C-alpha cells in the first residue's frame, strides 16, 4: 500500500530472515506440545504402557525451553529492527526540522512535535512489531493445527471445518443486529435523560413559583420511563449472550452427533477426540487476535504516514549564490512587508529605515506587536514578499546561507543553551576554527567570573539541561560573549530583563566596547541606557513610523518620542 | 463498608435472592457439562461401545436450556433490582437537590452534575450487578469446579491443588519484580527524551549559528543512547515471558512426575486426567475475575458515597413561620453589603434605599453591578451577610419561604419551561383551584394571542421541551404567563435583552401599564426605556452607594443619571 518503509529496513532486512527460525518455532513447539497429548491419552494412561510417560514431561520442559529461547531471540530481533529503524527515522526528521522554514515548531503553534516523535514513532514501531509477530505466529499456529487435524482424522477434520463458518456467520450477524437494536433505543434513553436535565436545570422557576410536589411527580414519571428503558436495555443486552452460547453449544452437539453415528466413524484411537477438542479450545484466543491485524497494520501505517508528511516537506529554499566574507554595506528597510501566518493584517506596513555602519540606531515601541519582527527578522526567516533589503548591491534572498546565519547574530532572554562545554557553547559550530585561548579571552570580555568561571571548572563545566539553571541575564551575557568571539558584524538585542541590573549595567552591550563604537546594532527599547545612547531613533509603533528625527531634536518638543519616554521612566 | 444501600434494597431484597438461585444453576451448568466428559470418553468411545452417546448431545441441550433461561431470568431480576434502586436513589437525591441552596449551581458545579446523578447512578448499578454476578456465578462456579476432587480425587489430584498456590505466589512475585525492573528505567528514557526536547527547542539558536551538523552529531549520540535504552526496555518484557511460562511447564511436569507412581494411578482409567486438565483450563478465567472483586465492590460504591454526600447535604432551612396572604407593605433595605458565598468579589452598595408598596419605583444600574443579586435578596435565593431586609415590620428570615414564594414574582429573559402544555405551564403547580377560565382571562390581557403563541392545539398549545424555541421576552410574565393568577405584590423586571421584536417591545410597555397600576416592582434597566415610566429614579450603581436621588436633582448636572443617559444614548 505505502511501502516507503521498505527502503529504510533494507540495511536491516536480514533481521526477519534471521528471526524466521523463531517465528516458525514459537508456534511449532505449542502445536507439538498439543500433539504429545495424544500419547498421554491412549499410548499412556489409556493402557498399562507408560514407556512414553518416562520422558514426556522432559519433552514438554525441553520444548518450551525452545519456545522461550525463540521468544527471547524473536523479541531481540524485532528490537534490533525497531530501534535501528526508528533511530534512522529520527536521524532523517531531526535533519529535516532544522531544514524546515518558519512553521509548526518555529512560530505557528505549540511545540507538541516532540510529543509526536516520542509517542507515535515508537507506536509505529510497536505496531509493526506486533503485526509481524502476530501474523507470523498465528499463521504458523493455524497451519500446524490444520496439519495435526488432517494427520489425525480427515473426516472429522473436514466436518469440523465446514461446521465452523456457519457458527461464525451466525454469531457475527446476531451480535451486529442486537447491537443495533441496543443503540437505536439507547439514543431514546439518552433523550429521556437530557429531557430530565432541563427539569433539573429549571430549578429557578420551581424554587420561586413553587412546584415541589408536581415537579417531583414529573421526575417520578420520567424516571419510570427510564426504568422501563433500563429493563429493555438489560433484556436486549442479556438476550444476545444466550443465543451466542446456544450456537456455540450446538456446534459441540453437531460434531458429537456426527461423531460415531456411522459405524465406520469412531474407528480412531478414541483419545484424539480429546486433543482435537482441546485444540479448538486453544485456538480461540489467536483467532480473536487474528481479526484486527489488518486494521492495526493500517492504523500504524497511518501514524507512519503522519510522520512521513512531517517528512519530505519543503526545506529552507535559498537559491542565492553570493558567498559572503564580511558585509559592511548598509541594511535598508524601505517600504517592506513580510507575511505572518494566521494574521490577515499585513505583518509590516510601509517602513523607511537605514542603519549605516558604526551608527547606533535605537528603535522604540509600546505595543510590542511588530517590535520584534522589524529587527529580529533581518536573518530572512520569514519570507519577504515585496521590498528589498539591500546588502552590498544584492538583495537578502541573493545571499547564500553562510557566515553567522546569513550575516548577523542575536541575543535575547530566550537563548536555549546546549549540553556541550559552555566554552564550545560559545564556540558552537566553529569550534575548530577558534582556539581555547581566544575562547577564554572572550570570557574575559564577558566579565562574569562570579557566575560562569569561579573554579566550577577551568571553563569546561556545562549548564545542564534542566540542571544548574544559570540566570537568564547571565545567559544573555555569555551569548553576547559568543557574539564578540564570532565577531558579530551587526547585533540584535531585545533587553527583556526589566529587573535588577546586577553587573549587567556594566556589560549592557558587550561592556560598551567596539561592538558599539563599530559593528552597528539595533536595540528594543526597555531601558534608558538604550534611549540616551542612540544616533537617530526611528519611532515605530503598530508597523508604521510617526517620527524619524534625531532623538535630541525630538526631546526638545513632545512629538511621539517624548510620550513613549513619559511612560517608560 | 457503607450499608446505606441495604435499607433501599429491603423493599426488593427478594430480587437478589431470586437472581442468585438462578445464577447458581447457571454456574453449575458449566461444571456439569465438564463432568459429562468422563461418560463421554471412557464410558463411551473409549470402551468402544454405543453406551449413551445418543444422549450426551441431548444432555448438552437439556443443560443449556437451564443455562440460557436462567441467564435471562437472572439478568431480568438484577435489572429489576437495579432499575428500582436507582429510581429511588434519583427520587431521593432530586428531593434533596432542588430543595438545597442555589450557590451550588453558581460556580460550585457546572452542567456535568447530570453525569453526577445520571452516569454515576448507572455506575453504582453496574458495579452492584458486577459484584452480584462475580460473587454468585463466580464463587459458586468455583465451588462447583472445586468439588471435582471429592468426586474423583481421593488421593490423585490433591497434589495438584497443593501445587497451585506455589504457582500463584511465584508468578506474582516474579511478575511484580520484573515490572519494577522495567519501570525503573522509564525515568532515564524521559531524561534522554527531554534532552532531545531541549535540543530541538534550541532550533532558533542553532539556526542563528547554523550548527545543524554538530547538533545532528549530538543527536546521533543521544539517539543511540535511547536506542540501547529501548533495547533494554523490550528485553525486560521479553525475558519476563519465559520465566512465567516456566512455572506452568514445571507445574505440568510435577503433575506427571506424581503420575509416574502407578500405586495411585491404578484407578483413573483415561478420561479423568482429561477432565482434571479441562477443569484447570476452565479455572483461569474465574480466578482472574475473582482477583478484582473487592476493588470493584468499592469502585462505584465509593462513587455511591459521593452521591450520598449530595443526598445528605443540608436543604434550605427557614425557621420563620410568618405567612401572609397579600404583602401590601414596604420592603426596607438597611446596610446590606453582602458578599455571595464562594468568592470575595468587590462588593455592592451599602444599600439603605426602601421600596414602598403602593409607591412605584424603578432601579437603574450599569456595568454588571450584580443588581440582579439584589433581586435575589427579595426572594432569598442567596444568603444575607450583614444589614437587613425587612418586610412589613418583620425581617427577611421571619417569613416562611412559601409565603414569599407566593408574594414575590420574577420576570427575566431566561425561564426554563417544562414538558407540558402552556395552560398548565402558566399554572405550574397551583392548577387545581385555577381552572381554564382563569387561564383564558389571563390570556385576554396577555396580548399574546398569536405572536409566538399561535393556535396549534388551541390556547392550551402543547409546549415542547427544548423543541418549541419561543422568544424569551414574551414567554413569561404576569399575563403573558403567570403571577396574575397569584396577583403577586412584589415582582422583578430584569429587562436583560433589547431586540427589535415586532410590537412585542410595545407589548412590554402595555404589560407595564397593566402591572404598575398596583404591585410596586423595581426593574433592572439594561436599557433606559422604563425609567420614563418611573416615579423615582434611584441612582445607585456600580459597586458602591452613590446617593438616593430623584428625577430632578440629578438631571440638571452630569451626576450619574444624566451620565447613564449620555453613555446609553
Coordinates of C-alpha atoms in Angstrom, one line a residue, chain A residues 44-307:
Chain A
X44 CA 0.0 -43.5 28.1
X45 CA -2.9 -43.6 30.6
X46 CA -5.2 -45.4 28.2
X47 CA -3.1 -48.6 28.5
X48 CA -0.8 -50.0 31.3
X49 CA 2.0 -49.0 28.9
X50 CA 4.0 -46.0 30.4
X51 CA 7.1 -46.1 28.3
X52 CA 6.2 -42.7 26.7
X53 CA 5.4 -41.3 30.2
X54 CA 9.0 -42.0 31.3
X55 CA 10.2 -38.9 29.3
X56 CA 7.2 -36.9 28.1
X57 CA 7.4 -34.3 30.9
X58 CA 11.1 -33.9 30.0
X59 CA 9.9 -33.3 26.4
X60 CA 7.5 -30.6 27.4
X61 CA 10.1 -28.9 29.5
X62 CA 12.7 -29.1 26.7
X63 CA 10.3 -27.9 24.0
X64 CA 9.2 -24.9 26.0
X65 CA 12.9 -24.0 26.6
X66 CA 13.0 -23.9 22.9
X67 CA 9.8 -21.8 23.0
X68 CA 11.3 -19.4 25.5
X69 CA 14.6 -19.1 23.6
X70 CA 12.7 -18.4 20.4
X71 CA 10.5 -15.8 22.1
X72 CA 13.6 -14.1 23.6
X73 CA 15.5 -14.0 20.3
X74 CA 12.5 -13.0 18.3
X75 CA 12.0 -10.1 20.7
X76 CA 15.7 -9.3 20.4
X77 CA 15.4 -9.3 16.6
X78 CA 12.4 -7.1 16.4
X79 CA 14.1 -4.9 18.9
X80 CA 17.2 -4.7 16.7
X81 CA 14.9 -3.9 13.8
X82 CA 12.6 -1.4 15.5
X83 CA 15.3 0.6 17.4
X84 CA 17.5 0.8 14.4
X85 CA 14.8 1.9 12.0
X86 CA 13.3 4.5 14.4
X87 CA 16.9 5.6 15.0
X88 CA 17.3 6.2 11.3
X89 CA 13.9 7.9 11.0
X90 CA 14.8 10.2 13.9
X91 CA 18.1 11.0 12.2
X92 CA 16.2 11.9 9.0
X93 CA 13.5 14.0 10.7
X94 CA 16.0 15.8 13.0
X95 CA 17.9 16.9 9.9
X96 CA 14.5 17.8 8.3
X97 CA 13.2 20.1 11.0
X98 CA 16.5 22.0 11.2
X99 CA 15.9 22.3 7.4
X100 CA 12.3 23.4 7.8
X101 CA 11.1 27.0 7.4
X102 CA 9.1 29.2 9.9
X103 CA 6.3 26.7 10.6
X104 CA 4.7 24.3 13.2
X105 CA 7.8 24.3 15.5
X106 CA 9.1 27.9 14.7
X107 CA 6.2 30.4 15.2
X108 CA 3.0 28.7 14.1
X109 CA 1.7 26.7 17.1
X110 CA 2.8 24.8 20.2
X111 CA 5.9 22.6 20.3
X112 CA 4.0 19.3 20.6
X113 CA 6.1 17.9 17.7
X114 CA 8.4 16.2 20.2
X115 CA 5.3 14.6 21.7
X116 CA 4.6 13.2 18.2
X117 CA 8.1 11.9 17.8
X118 CA 8.4 10.5 21.3
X119 CA 4.9 8.7 21.3
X120 CA 3.8 7.9 17.8
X121 CA 7.2 6.9 16.4
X122 CA 7.6 4.1 19.0
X123 CA 3.8 3.5 18.5
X124 CA 4.6 2.8 14.8
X125 CA 7.5 0.6 15.8
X126 CA 5.4 -1.4 18.3
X127 CA 2.6 -1.6 15.8
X128 CA 4.8 -3.0 13.1
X129 CA 6.4 -5.5 15.5
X130 CA 3.1 -6.6 16.9
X131 CA 1.6 -7.0 13.4
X132 CA 4.6 -9.1 12.3
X133 CA 4.8 -11.4 15.3
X134 CA 1.0 -11.8 15.3
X135 CA 0.6 -12.6 11.6
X136 CA 3.5 -15.0 11.5
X137 CA 2.9 -16.7 14.8
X138 CA -0.9 -17.1 14.2
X139 CA -0.3 -18.3 10.6
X140 CA 2.1 -20.9 11.9
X141 CA -0.4 -21.9 14.6
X142 CA -3.2 -22.3 12.0
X143 CA -1.0 -24.3 9.6
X144 CA 0.3 -26.6 12.4
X145 CA -3.1 -27.2 13.9
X146 CA -4.6 -27.9 10.5
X147 CA -1.7 -30.3 9.9
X148 CA -2.4 -32.1 13.1
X149 CA -6.2 -32.3 12.4
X150 CA -5.6 -33.7 8.9
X151 CA -3.0 -36.1 10.2
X152 CA -5.4 -37.4 12.9
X153 CA -8.8 -37.7 11.2
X154 CA -9.5 -36.1 7.8
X155 CA -13.2 -36.8 8.0
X156 CA -13.6 -35.3 11.5
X157 CA -11.3 -32.5 10.2
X158 CA -13.5 -31.5 7.2
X159 CA -16.7 -31.9 9.1
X160 CA -15.4 -29.6 11.9
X161 CA -14.0 -27.0 9.4
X162 CA -17.3 -26.9 7.5
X163 CA -19.2 -26.6 10.8
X164 CA -17.0 -23.5 11.7
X165 CA -18.2 -20.9 9.2
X166 CA -21.9 -21.4 10.0
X167 CA -21.4 -20.6 13.7
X168 CA -19.0 -17.8 12.7
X169 CA -21.6 -16.0 10.5
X170 CA -24.4 -16.7 12.9
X171 CA -22.6 -15.1 15.9
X172 CA -21.3 -12.2 13.7
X173 CA -24.7 -11.2 12.4
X174 CA -26.7 -11.8 15.6
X175 CA -24.1 -9.7 17.5
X176 CA -24.3 -6.9 15.0
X177 CA -28.1 -6.8 14.8
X178 CA -28.6 -7.0 18.5
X179 CA -26.0 -4.2 19.0
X180 CA -28.0 -2.1 16.5
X181 CA -31.2 -3.0 18.5
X182 CA -29.4 -1.8 21.6
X183 CA -28.1 1.5 20.2
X184 CA -31.2 2.7 18.2
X185 CA -33.1 2.9 21.6
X186 CA -30.2 3.8 23.8
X187 CA -30.5 7.0 21.9
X188 CA -34.0 7.3 23.2
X189 CA -32.7 6.6 26.7
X190 CA -30.2 9.5 26.3
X191 CA -33.1 11.7 25.0
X192 CA -35.1 11.0 28.1
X193 CA -32.1 11.7 30.4
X194 CA -31.4 15.0 28.6
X195 CA -35.1 15.8 29.0
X196 CA -34.7 15.3 32.7
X197 CA -31.7 17.6 32.6
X198 CA -33.9 20.5 31.6
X199 CA -36.2 19.7 34.5
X200 CA -33.2 19.8 36.8
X201 CA -31.8 23.0 35.2
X202 CA -35.2 24.7 35.6
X203 CA -34.7 24.7 39.4
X204 CA -35.1 28.5 39.5
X205 CA -38.8 28.8 38.5
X206 CA -39.9 25.9 40.6
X207 CA -37.9 27.4 43.5
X208 CA -39.8 30.7 43.2
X209 CA -43.2 29.8 41.7
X210 CA -43.4 26.6 43.8
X211 CA -43.7 23.1 42.3
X212 CA -42.0 20.7 44.7
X213 CA -44.8 18.1 44.6
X214 CA -45.7 18.5 40.9
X215 CA -42.0 18.6 39.8
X216 CA -41.2 15.5 41.9
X217 CA -44.2 13.8 40.3
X218 CA -42.9 14.7 36.9
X219 CA -39.5 13.3 37.7
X220 CA -41.1 10.2 39.1
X221 CA -42.9 9.6 35.8
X222 CA -39.9 10.3 33.7
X223 CA -37.8 8.1 35.9
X224 CA -40.3 5.3 35.5
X225 CA -40.0 5.6 31.7
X226 CA -36.2 5.4 32.3
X227 CA -36.8 2.3 34.5
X228 CA -38.6 0.6 31.6
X229 CA -35.8 1.7 29.3
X230 CA -33.3 0.1 31.6
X231 CA -35.4 -3.1 31.7
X232 CA -35.3 -3.2 27.9
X233 CA -31.6 -2.3 27.9
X234 CA -30.7 -5.3 30.0
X235 CA -33.2 -7.6 28.2
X236 CA -31.6 -6.7 24.8
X237 CA -28.1 -7.0 26.2
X238 CA -28.8 -10.2 28.0
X239 CA -30.6 -12.0 25.1
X240 CA -27.6 -11.8 22.8
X241 CA -25.4 -13.9 25.1
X242 CA -27.8 -16.9 25.4
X243 CA -28.2 -17.1 21.6
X244 CA -24.5 -16.8 21.1
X245 CA -23.7 -19.5 23.7
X246 CA -26.6 -21.6 22.3
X247 CA -25.0 -21.7 18.9
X248 CA -21.6 -22.4 20.5
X249 CA -23.0 -25.4 22.3
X250 CA -24.9 -26.5 19.2
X251 CA -21.5 -26.7 17.4
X252 CA -20.4 -29.2 20.0
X253 CA -23.7 -31.0 19.7
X254 CA -23.4 -31.2 15.9
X255 CA -19.9 -32.5 15.9
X256 CA -20.6 -35.1 18.5
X257 CA -23.9 -36.2 16.8
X258 CA -21.8 -36.7 13.6
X259 CA -19.3 -38.4 15.7
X260 CA -19.8 -42.2 15.8
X261 CA -23.3 -42.0 14.2
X262 CA -21.9 -44.1 11.4
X263 CA -20.2 -47.4 12.4
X264 CA -17.2 -46.6 10.2
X265 CA -16.7 -43.4 12.2
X266 CA -15.2 -43.7 15.7
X267 CA -12.7 -46.2 14.3
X268 CA -10.0 -43.8 15.6
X269 CA -7.8 -44.1 18.7
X270 CA -10.8 -42.7 20.6
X271 CA -8.5 -40.3 22.6
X272 CA -7.7 -38.0 19.7
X273 CA -11.2 -36.5 20.1
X274 CA -10.0 -35.0 23.3
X275 CA -6.9 -33.5 21.8
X276 CA -8.7 -32.0 18.8
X277 CA -11.3 -30.5 21.1
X278 CA -8.5 -29.1 23.2
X279 CA -7.0 -27.6 20.1
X280 CA -10.4 -25.9 19.3
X281 CA -10.4 -24.6 22.9
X282 CA -6.9 -23.3 22.5
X283 CA -7.1 -21.6 19.1
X284 CA -10.0 -19.1 20.0
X285 CA -7.6 -16.6 21.5
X286 CA -5.3 -16.5 18.5
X287 CA -8.3 -16.4 16.2
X288 CA -9.7 -13.4 18.1
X289 CA -6.2 -11.8 17.8
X290 CA -6.1 -12.5 14.1
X291 CA -9.2 -10.4 13.2
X292 CA -7.7 -7.0 13.9
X293 CA -4.3 -7.5 12.3
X294 CA -5.1 -5.6 9.1
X295 CA -6.8 -2.7 10.9
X296 CA -3.8 -2.4 13.3
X297 CA -1.4 -2.6 10.4
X298 CA -3.2 0.2 8.6
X299 CA -3.6 2.3 11.7
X300 CA 0.1 2.1 12.4
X301 CA 0.8 2.8 8.7
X302 CA -1.4 5.9 9.1
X303 CA 0.7 7.1 12.0
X304 CA 3.8 6.4 9.9
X305 CA 2.2 8.5 7.1
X306 CA 1.7 11.3 9.6
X307 CA 5.4 11.1 10.4

